[PDB]
Amino acid sequence: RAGPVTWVMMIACVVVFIAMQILGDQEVMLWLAWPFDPTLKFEFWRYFTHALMHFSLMHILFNLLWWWYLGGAVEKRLGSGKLIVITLISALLSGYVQQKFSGPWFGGLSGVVYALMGYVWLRGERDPQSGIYLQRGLIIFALIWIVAGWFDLGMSMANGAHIAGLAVGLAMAFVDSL
Ligand SMILES: *C(=O)C[C@@H](NC(=O)OCC(C)C)c1ccccc1
Numbered sequence: 001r002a003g004p005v006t007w008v009m010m011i012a013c014v015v016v017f018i019a020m021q022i023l024g025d026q027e028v029m030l031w032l033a034w035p036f037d038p039t040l041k042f043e044f045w046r047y048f049t050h051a052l053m054h055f056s057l058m059h060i061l062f063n064l065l066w067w068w069y070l071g072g073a074v075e076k077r078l079g080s081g082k083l084i085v086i087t088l089i090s091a092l093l094s095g096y097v098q099q100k101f102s103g104p105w106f107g108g109l110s111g112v113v114y115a116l117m118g119y120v121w122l123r124g125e126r127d128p129q130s131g132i133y134l135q136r137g138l139i140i141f142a143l144i145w146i147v148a149g150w151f152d153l154g155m156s157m158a159n160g161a162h163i164a165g166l167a168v169g170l171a172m173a174f175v176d177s178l
């Protein structure tokens, strides 16, 4: 079964998605979005909590599916701490890049998922003996979803923020395979 970080993230995303149905998207964004006013710059959960919001069924379904599989594998073979750090860093950097180019109204686990995909892929590529790797079939489906995002075949975050997410995963896999 999915480990505690994999699980709690899934739940938290579900709980937040429910809140968005009941209260509407904007009202939840009011509490969880990246600081959108200087008077909010010190509400520190906001530098992370944007990752918890999703805006359509597809968004959350595909995000949580990749999270469950990639995040769950990383947690199981490499431990909870590893997943936590990949998540915190990719969420911060992809959120940063996203707000820089398009403002603070966005959300979702996509940055985090790009990181995990980059992490699992490069890790297996550079260091089979780790046990971690991204199957050929999954590389293909990952590539297809990356293309969908690149050429807009409607998503919260832009290409840049997804790249920022990927860079974190590649960076960490690179570090680890030394
Ligand atoms: C974030 O990138 C939103 C995408 N997520 C997607 O499925 O990417 C998966 C790749 C493995 C990175 C999305 C998907 C469906 C609907 C909306 C947004």
Ligand SMILES: [Cl-]
Binding pocket: 001, 002
């Ligand atoms: Cl499970």
Ligand SMILES: [Cl-]
Binding pocket: 107, 108, 110, 155, 156, 157, 158
């Ligand atoms: Cl997105």
Ligand SMILES: [Cl-]
Binding pocket: 078, 176
């Ligand atoms: Cl390791």
